């Protein structure tokens, strides 16, 4: 909401370090957050009438942004479903939706993940951006165990104006991203 616990932290606790850290000149020039994406393949638009909207009202139930129903671009014999419509669910988070999300994720989510011993440190690489996956979806607060017929993993991709990994690394690190280190 224009401001959050993490947003502040970034501005008055991370902003400083990085500069002092890599020594940036211009204000802008220092790592900021562009957007964090969270999609789901599902691949379950098969027979039995693949509603799987529950996964849409949910994906967004924990995000606050109804997702965008992506479809198959080509068409594959090998694993049924092809040519069009079928599967695909994905929402793009920016600004405040971006912050009020990462918070929970970093504070309440990542925490309870079967074993979770930090976040694999290689998922950066050349990417002034980062990527990571989740098996469950109940790892979040806004949703409980009872209500969720089936499971639902998902990919989370954070984009950064960072050019290097160190730049990206440090940032997500000063923010609160745990790390398999």
């Amino acid at each position: 909401p224009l401001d959050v616990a993490l947003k502040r932290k970034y501005y008055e606790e991370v902003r400083p370090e990085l500069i002092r850290r890599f020594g940036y000149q211009n204000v802008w020039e220092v790592p900021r957050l562009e957007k964090v994406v969270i999609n789901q393949g599902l691949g379950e638009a098969k027979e039995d009438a693949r509603i799987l909207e529950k996964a849409a009202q949910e994906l967004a139930l924990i995000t606050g942004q109804k997702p965008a129903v992506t479809r198959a671009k080509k068409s594959i014999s090998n694993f049924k479903l092809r040519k069009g419509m079928p599967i695909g669910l994905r929402v793009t988070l920016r600004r405040d939706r971006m912050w009020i999300f990462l918070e929970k994720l970093l504070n309440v989510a990542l925490p309870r993940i079967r074993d979770f011993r930090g976040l694999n440190p290689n998922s950066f690489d050349g990417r002034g951006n980062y990527n990571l996956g989740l098996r469950e979806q109940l790892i979040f607060p806004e949703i409980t165990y009872d209500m969720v017929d089936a499971l639902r993993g998902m990919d989370i991709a954070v984009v950064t104006t960072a050019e290097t990994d160190e730049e990206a690394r440090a940032l997500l690190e000063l923010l609160g991203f745990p790390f398999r280190k």
């Binding site: 909401p1 616990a5 924990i62 606050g64 918070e103 929970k104 504070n107 309440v108 309870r112 607060p141």
Partner: peptide, 30 residues
Amino acid sequence: VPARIICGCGNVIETYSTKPEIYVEVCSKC
């Protein structure tokens, strides 16, 4: 809407989302 994270590991979290009635059975305490 704002919210509250009522874990068990003490530690409450005042932020935003939907339904400020959250029983986070395990915050960042492990």
